[PDB]
RNA sequence: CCGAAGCUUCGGCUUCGGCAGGAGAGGUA
């Protein structure tokens, strides 16, 4: 996510993330 | 004993070797003492007259003079005086 | 394609009923393919005849004590599990043992039908000092392995017979080694040390012979498929 | 060795030098972990010999101040409402007011379910206080720990000495002659390489008009013209092989950002440092006795783990006081046998 | 003085062995071990050391 | 000559030659330069050490046959065994969940919601609730998959090309024995895990002397393993010979193979002709030192048993 | 016996090569020779195989903290860069493989071949010379292994039954063979119970005086045996004339075995027989399915009531410091004692759970490794850490590994981790200048005579009388009155004399002593003997690495400062005298 | 009570690829050891072809990329090694492969001689643009099992030649199934149910006859003792 | 001591050619 192309990678989290490193 | 045969490096074993000496420090000296006459035997005999004696057991095919030695003090055959 | 080192099979002879045979140098790996079943066709193919069932007079509700002999059933029947019986007759055949009078019964009496016999007459069985009879009658068939006892629910054709362990094959303990050797410079070549005891009925050179033919036969239907396939050859000896 | 170990190479905050400590006469005191360390220093990246607590990494969301202060962020709560206003704090500031917990539950509108929670009170103090006077919450889980630490799959389930060694032995890797990304990862993978830079991204959006095994066209949307190049089999500081492969075809899209190339332990854009094997757990007659391992022969017959080391070797000519040194076919010495693979 | 200068303190077991004319008598391990010689313990003592082996009497007559 | 070292090899894959008159720069008082490249490569043996990201760390002891390897109910050979004993002393355990999610990402599963979304399936997202064979997921450091969430996919699997599920419920599978062929008598765990290679190999290690170059003060072997050096024979290496009693292999191994200049060349012919080792001379770090020591303005002499200082320097 | 590659004794062995090579007419000069040698000719891989034989090598391992870590082989020619280590050896070496390397070194002369071949052969040292225990024993994997087979299972597969009325006892067999005929089938277990007719094994004790006894002609006298065939497949590794042990085989009982056997029998037989007992622990190691899974580690039931409990409890202190009737010392005193509480009734409660053939219960039961604290912080409950100061934290961590740390717990767990990687490092180096000062001071002590016939000595305690008038016997006995020599007889009651002046205390000594009333003894030591330079070898006592008198000319001095300087990196401190 | 039932053999056909073999009756612990024997006889020693070496023009080493084609020699060679091949002859024989301009090298563009067939001719070898051309020549040997490759400074070649490991075997995946009838009255017996899968090189009931030749023969050094 | 080249009676003789210390940083057991 928040790049042009990159694989699909599926999550298990379950918190949401205010910042981006 | 009843132990198996002993193969390679642990024959004869140690602790009938060890029944005709007084501790482990004058078997190493002893053997290594014979050993040298025997190499000795052997370097000089094809040159010409030597003093020594040679291997009085039957040795193998290509045998080190130490296992040589090692055999003829298992069986009984020399002697030897301590310092 | 070629082998080219030939194995060769050598035998080292322990007691008339022990041995220890080598064969060396076998291809990498090929050492673990030959033990096993080697071992199996060994201990579980070969033919042999052994004693199935027993009938011991006097005893009939309870199994515990004979009146007349020193011993106890249990005695008894391990003595008789270790009878070297060799029989021809394909159908089971009947024995009867009848000793009278003090003095320890050996295997020598036993008087067996014409087709049947056995190698080990001096083996005691049981000994009898208290003024008793012993009758005892024996059924000895033929097979191969290890059958356990065969529990009959008859109800009618044996109220008395006590149904044994049979022990057909006639070789007792198979065990076998793999180790290591060097041909020219390739070290890791495989060598296979096999132990055999059989029993007196057979001799352990005999029973490699007889466990390699009943071998060809059963990986001989594989090669049936196609008669030319380009497997590895041997050479001639 | 790999793009990990040069990023974290440039990451590490170090105690020794000319007017810090030194290795004899630090003690047991100044390498311990703090309870101001944390969100400012990674407490299990740490190396495992003499130097055990002199060096350390600094973690993902630190910052430095224009003194030389280590900040850390976090989201400012009112009304027992979590708020997203984030604030950097020095750890001077952040000693004055009850921090709470990252793994807290959070309602819809942002209200905290449990009736109490885990805070952090003035000097490192942990305590259950319940959630109505707290002032402060953490951003995300992973504050307190580093790039390399935030890379293991199941941390919490691991003791601190074993996932130490795990962290460090991730920069010793050496890359293969092909690469593919882990079946099971943690997300931080891509972003530890395209930050780190062995691979090729676009600065601008275009279509790709050539592609070949050591260069790459791309048309910009105005009429410019950029060609990017390939390190076809470099040699690293290492001795191993860097190597970076086209990953478009001829006609595609490209926005900017867009990975363009691979590069050494890449796999599409995202880390991968080794591969996936299928395992058995159990005995096996003494070969994996006291930490030994039993691999297959389908290892190197389909050359899985392979790689390419590479080395140089140098020479000099030179003038002396008795003549001139000079590099020739001729040598009066030796044979004709050995002088056949030199040219002229 | 040579077994104490190769322990700690070389500069001043020198100085108070030169000032007083010390001397070594060399029957230690470590000084033995030092010079190239034959420890005075295991197989390096008198008794072990001077062992002669000949053949008995009977063997050689045999042979 | 410039010539490849000892124990090395490779083809050539690039020379780059400087030059002092095509005005390229050079250091002052030569005249070319000259680079050369040496490339090889590399597989895996025995003594490379492998590593996991958990702290898992071994050398490689043996290389089997796939014949000779533990193989599941269709076929499938496994490719590496670890041993069972050191992952409870060790407490990491995230080793086994994570072949346990390996194991379920590598096949493929589909959770089933007929009769509403399972209990155990509750907090997961709508697109963790089917897979496809060969997924990648993502379990961020310290907030993830629960137990629950894994001890409930792993009876949701997919089957292989025939319909059979190898791996049960608990992640078990019975496997075959390669070299006998009977089955092993209890499940034993399968799974996948992520393997990397470590920068520890056996051919930069492996080192063998019998004589080579030695110093020039102290005229002992040289040190190292790219100079061709020998071994130190340390101080704590002393003290176990003098404890064993041995007192002929430790002189043996102080002058004549480490300093005795005249005794190194007769052992050497002695060996090659067959006869007997000689008697050790003394050793010359002991001359240095007594020379070190008269610079000092110290009168140090070797006496005899009657005085007569013994000159100590050969010559005659 | 060892593996060395091939590549590195061609060069360790390259003049011995050489003079074989001209020898056998292979080459001309010496040259040629080395030559050929050097440039590695399909020739010369022949003639390394009779050049090595019997040919010993030294293997050494860094630090060498002891004698062990140096040890002579006779080596083998195997393919690959690696060398080959028996598993026996790495107890005396402290070598795992993970990474480790050793050093190689060659024997030239005659008594330096013979030195190595006769004092430091692997198989001629198996006692440790501090405690005279055996060091080259089963462990891990071959205990394990061992453990399993030896074990009785109730209710199985064909075991003994005592059937009557309709059909025989159903389960005694005739013959060790036949019982394994039976178990290639299915029809037997290897661990369930049965009555096994027996004949080459020599039977217990108290069988042996009720049926034979005058004496057990073993070669062919057959009893009756109630074990079962794990048990008797086990006492066939065992020598001929060793007595029927039929017990489960936990480490201490194998290692009572071996010493036995080391105290009782040449010391060839022990070398024969410990090889054997690792081929059937290895063997049997990978048929016991030990094996770890999610699934097998399991929770306990009601741990939420017992947390919850013990909090209300917590609660209520902290109300009692906030009402002002508590000061931080006090509050963090009850706290520590509130929580120390919860632990113990969570391990107990883990505990009563477990099966005893769970796999990880049976590593830890075993002896193998492992203690139950791991296993409580695995599936139960960490506990308390502490702080970088020192002192434990009033807040515990409830989460066990199993089922993960938060960010909290976790962070702070880290406290005391560190400290131990941080002083274990620092003890490696305060323990090193503790052994070589030892060294220096005690170089010149060594067995110099027979006897000084001295009188002096020192009296040891050896046991004491309850009030009732059983003796308790010393705990600390085996290292303060064991392997010495009496300097006065010991007399009792105004009687005779059960040992006599010159003898060494062994066991039977030992017992003889105390089952007649003795306590105070007088022995002889070093610390008073009266010869001049160095000790004698009656005061010394006996060697325990081979269990006999000293030998004249033992260097007793290096020995006992290895002895004592060895275990010093595992000397924690206390956590002010 | 001896069997005197033989056993048989049958197969049973599933794909060209698979088959599966029933052998019947058998003793009651025969089944599993030879069942292994025949499938260790399978996976290690089934003779083959394979390729030994490339050549291809312009190019030296490995180490190396060629103009105007998308991947570097390390990967062409990497995708060659999926090659199918199978030969006839005893000696080594030569195919080539010549392309031009743009498309894709598939396996169906290698011409073959006489004797030598390719069983895979949609493969993925390459893939070339407008300014690229690519020149190979490999050499096809007859052999068993793996062999790693042979230096060409051993063997006395050109620069220009690349040594390839080859892989001989033609099986893919062998696995076996028993099933036991263990009723009462003691009349037991064992069925053996074997599955093999090749590589299109051969048939699958012609592995076994190889491995049943190679079985045959080794097992008559203990019957010569008559 | 090694190499090259001559004499060489086969033991060897002769000509020419040739060297290896410190400081700092990181790492493995
Ligand atoms: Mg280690
Ligand atoms: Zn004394």
Redesign the pocket.
């Known amino acids: 996510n928040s790049v042009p192309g990159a694989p699909n990678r599926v999550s298990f989290a379950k918190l949401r993330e205010p910042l981006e490193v | 004993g009843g132990y198996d045969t002993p193969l390679g490096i642990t024959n004869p074993p140690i602790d009938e070797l060890l029944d005709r000496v007084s501790s482990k420090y004058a078997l190493v000296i002893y053997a290594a003492k014979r050993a040298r006459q025997i190499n000795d035997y052997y370097n000089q005999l094809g040159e010409g007259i030597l003093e020594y004696v040679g291997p009085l057991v039957e040795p193998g095919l290509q045998e080190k003079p130490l296992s040589i030695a090692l055999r003829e003090i298992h069986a009984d055959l020399l002697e030897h005086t301590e310092g | 394609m070629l082998i080219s080192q030939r194995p060769t099979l050598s035998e080292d002879v322990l007691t008339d009923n022990r041995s220890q045979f080598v064969i060396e140098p076998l291809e990498p790996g090929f050492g673990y393919t030959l033990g096993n079943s080697l071992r199996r066709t060994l201990l579980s193919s070969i033919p042999g005849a052994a004693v199935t069932s027993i009938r011991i007079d006097g005893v009939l509700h309870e199994f515990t004590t004979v009146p007349g002999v020193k011993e106890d059933v249990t005695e008894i029947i391990l003595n008789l599990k270790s009878l070297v019986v060799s029989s021809e007759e394909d159908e089971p055949v009947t024995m009867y043992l009848r000793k009278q009078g003090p003095g320890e019964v050996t295997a020598g009496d036993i008087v067996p039908p014409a087709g049947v016999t056995v190698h080990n007459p001096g083996m005691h069985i049981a000994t009898l000092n208290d003024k008793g009879k012993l009758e005892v009658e024996l059924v000895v068939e033929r097979g191969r392995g290890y059958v356990p006892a065969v529990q009959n629910r008859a109800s009618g054709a044996e109220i008395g017979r006590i149904p044994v362990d049979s022990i057909y094959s006639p070789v007792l303990k198979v065990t076998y080694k793999v180790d290591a050797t060097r041909v020219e410079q390739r070290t890791d070549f495989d060598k296979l040390i096999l132990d055999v005891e059989t029993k007196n009925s057979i001799s352990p050179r005999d029973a490699l012979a007889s466990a390699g033919k009943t071998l060809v036969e059963l990986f001989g239907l594989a090669r049936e498929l196609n008669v030319e396939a380009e497997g590895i050859e041997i050479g001639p000896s | 060795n790999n793009p990990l170990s040069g990023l974290t190479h440039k990451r590490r905050l ?1 105690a ?2 000319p007017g810090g400590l030194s ?1 004899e006469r630090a003690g047991l005191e100044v390498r311990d972990v703090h309870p101001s360390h944390y969100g400012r220093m990674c407490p299990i990246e740490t ?5 055990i607590g ?2 350390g990494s600094l973690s993902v969301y630190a910052r430095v101040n224009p003194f030389g202060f280590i900040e850390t962020p976090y989201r400012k709560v009112v009304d027992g409402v979590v708020s997203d206003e984030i604030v950097y704090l020095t750890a001077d500031e952040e000693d004055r007011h009850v921090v709470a917990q990252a793994n807290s539950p959070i309602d819809a509108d942002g209200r905290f379910v449990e009736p109490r929670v885990l805070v952090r009170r003035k000097a490192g103090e942990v305590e259950y206080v319940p959630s109505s006077e707290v002032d402060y919450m953490d951003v995300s889980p992973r504050q307190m720990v580093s790039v390399a630490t935030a890379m293991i799959p199941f941390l919490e389930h691991d003791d601190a000495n074993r996932a130490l ?1 795990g962290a ?2 991730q920069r ?1 890797a050496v890359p293969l002659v092909r690469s593919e990304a882990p079946l099971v990862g943690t997300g931080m993978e891509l972003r530890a390489a395209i930050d780190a830079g062995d691979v090729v991204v676009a600065e601008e959006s275009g279509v790709i008009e050539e592609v070949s095994a050591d260069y790459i066209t791309v048309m910009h949307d105005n009429g410019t013209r950029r060609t990017y190049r390939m390190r076809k089999f470099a040699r690293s500081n290492h001795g191993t092989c860097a190597n970076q492969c086209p990953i478009v075809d001829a006609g595609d899209r490209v926005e900017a950002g867009q990975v363009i190339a691979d590069g050494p332990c890449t796999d599409d854009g995202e880390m991968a440092l080794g591969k996936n094997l299928l395992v058995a757990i159990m005995p096996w007659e003494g070969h994996n006795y006291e930490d030994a391992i039993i691999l297959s022969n389908r290892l190197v017959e389909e050359d899985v783990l392979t790689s390419i080391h590479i080395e140089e070797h140098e020479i000099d000519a030179r003038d002396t006081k008795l003549g001139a040194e000079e590099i020739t076919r001729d040598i ?3 044979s004709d046998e050995v002088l056949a693979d030199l040219d002229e | 003085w040579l077994s104490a200068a190769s322990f700690q303190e070389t500069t001043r077991v020198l100085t108070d062995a030169a000032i007083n004319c010390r001397s070594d008598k060399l029957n230690g391990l470590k000084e033995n071990v030092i010079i190239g010689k034959l420890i005075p313990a295991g197989t390096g003592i008198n008794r072990y050391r001077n062992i002669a082996v000949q053949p008995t009497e009977e063997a050689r007559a045999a042979a | 000559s410039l010539k490849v070292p000892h124990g090395e090899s490779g083809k050539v894959i690039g020379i780059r030659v400087f030059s002092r008159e095509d005005e390229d720069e050079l250091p002052a008082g030569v005249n070319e330069l000259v680079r050369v490249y040496v490339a090889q490569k590399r597989k895996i043996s025995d003594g490379d ?1 492998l590593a996991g990201r958990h702290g898992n ?1 071994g050398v490689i002891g043996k290389i089997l046959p796939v014949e000779d390897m533990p193989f599941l109910a269709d076929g499938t050979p496994v490719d590496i065994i670890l041993n069972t004993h050191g992952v409870p002393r060790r407490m990491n355990i995230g080793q086994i969940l994570e072949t346990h999610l390996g194991w379920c990402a590598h096949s493929g599963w589909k959770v089933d919601a007929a009769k509403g979304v399972p209990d155990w399936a509750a907090r997961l997202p709508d697109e963790l609730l089917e897979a496809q064979p060969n997924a990648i997921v993502s379990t961020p450091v310290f907030d993830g998959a629960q137990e629950a969430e894994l001890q409930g996919l792993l009876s949701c699997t997919l089957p292989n090309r025939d319909g059979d599920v190898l791996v049960d419920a608990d992640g078990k599978a019975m496997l075959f024995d390669g070299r006998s062929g009977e089955p092993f008598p209890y499940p034993v765990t399968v799974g996948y895990m992520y393997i990397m290679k ?1 920068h ?1 190999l056996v051919d930069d290690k492996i080192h063998a002397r019998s004589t ?7 005229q002992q072997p ?2 190292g393993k790219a ?1 061709f050096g020998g071994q130190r024979f340390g101080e704590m290496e002393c003290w176990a010979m003098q404890a064993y009693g041995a007192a002929y292999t430790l002189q043996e191994l102080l002058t004549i193979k480490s300093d005795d200049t005249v005794g190194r ?1 007769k052992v050497y ?1 002695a060996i090659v002709k067959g006869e007997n080792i000689p008697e050790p001379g003394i050793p010359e770090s002991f001359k240095v030192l007594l020379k070190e020591l008269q610079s000092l303005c110290l009168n140090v002499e070797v006496l005899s048993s009657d005085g007569a200082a013994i000159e100590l320097r050969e010559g005659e | 016996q060892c593996g060395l590659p091939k590549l590195m004794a061609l060069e360790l062995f390259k003049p011995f090569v050489m003079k074989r090579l001209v020898d056998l007419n292979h080459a001309q000069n ?2 040629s020779a ?2 050929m040698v050097e440039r590695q000719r399909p020739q010369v891989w022949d003639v390394l195989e009779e050049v090595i034989a019997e040919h010993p090598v030294l293997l050494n ?3 060498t903290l002891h004698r062990l870590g140096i040890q002579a082989f006779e080596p083998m020619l195997v393919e690959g860069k690696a060398i080959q280590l028996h598993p026996l050896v790495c107890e005396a070496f402290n ?2 493989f ?4 050793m050093a190689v070194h060659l024997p030239l002369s005659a008594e330096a071949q013979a030195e190595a071949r006769i004092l430091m052969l692997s198989s001629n040292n198996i006692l440790s010379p501090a405690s005279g225990r055996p060091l080259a024993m089963p462990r891990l994997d071959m205990v394990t292994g061992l453990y399993y087979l030896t074990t009785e299972v109730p209710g199985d597969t064909g075991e003994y039954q005592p059937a009557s009325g309709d059909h025989p006892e159903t389960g005694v067999y005739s013959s060790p063979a036949e019982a394994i005929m039976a178990a290639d089938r299915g029809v037997l277990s290897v661990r369930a119970k049965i009555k096994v007719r027996l004949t080459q094994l020599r039977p217990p004790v108290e069988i042996e005086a009720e049926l034979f006894g005058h004496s057990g002609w073993q070669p062919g006298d057959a009893w009756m045996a109630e074990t079962t065939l794990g048990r008797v497949m086990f006492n066939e590794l065992l020598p001929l004339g060793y007595p029927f042990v039929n017990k489960q085989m936990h480490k201490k009982v194998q290692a009572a075995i071996i010493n036995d056997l080391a105290e009782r029998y040449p010391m060839i037989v022990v070398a024969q027989t410990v090889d054997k007992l690792k081929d059937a622990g290895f063997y049997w190691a990978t048929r016991s399915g030990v094996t770890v899974s999610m699934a097998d580690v399991l929770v306990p039931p009601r741990k939420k009531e017992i947390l919850d409990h013990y909090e209300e409890r917590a609660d209520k202190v902290e109300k009692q410091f906030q009402r002002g009737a508590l000061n931080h010392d006090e509050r963090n005193e009850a706290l520590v004692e509130i929580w120390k509480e919860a632990t113990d009734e969570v391990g107990q409660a883990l505990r009563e759970h477990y099966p005893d053939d769970n796999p990880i219960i049976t590593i830890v039961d075993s002896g193998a490794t492992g203690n139950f604290t791991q296993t409580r912080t695995l599936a139960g409950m960490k506990g308390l850490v502490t702080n970088p100061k020192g002192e434990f934290i009033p807040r515990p961590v409830k989460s066990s590994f199993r089922e993960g740390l938060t960010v909290l717990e976790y962070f702070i767990n880290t406290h005391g981790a560190r400290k131990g990687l941080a002083d274990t490092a620092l003890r490696t180096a305060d323990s090193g200048y503790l052994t070589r000062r030892l060294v220096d001071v005690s170089q010149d002590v060594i067995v110099r005579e027979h006897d000084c016939q001295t009188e002096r000595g020192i009296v040891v305690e050896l046991a004491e009388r309850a009030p009732d008038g059983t003796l308790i016997r010393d705990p600390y006995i085996e290292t303060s009155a064991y392997a010495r020599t009496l300097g006065t007889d010991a007399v009792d009651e105004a009687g005779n004399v059960i040992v006599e002046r010159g003898q060494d205390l062994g066991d039977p000594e030992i017992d003889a002593l105390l089952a007649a009333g003795i306590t105070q003894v007088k022995v002889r030591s070093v610390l008073t003997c009266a010869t001049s330079t160095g000790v004698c070898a009656t005061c010394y006592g006996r060697s325990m690495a081979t269990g006999k008198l000293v030998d004249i000319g033992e260097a007793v001095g290096i020995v006992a400062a290895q002895s004592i300087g060895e275990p010093g990196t595992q000397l924690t401190m206390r956590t002010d005298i």
């Open positions: 170090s020794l030098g290795r190396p495992e010999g003499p130097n002199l060096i060694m460090n032995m010793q009066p010495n030796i | 050490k760390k470590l520890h080579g170059p030695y110093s020039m003060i102290t040289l040190g100079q060349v012919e | 010496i040259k080395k030559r391992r860094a630090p070598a795992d993970d990474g480790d390397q």
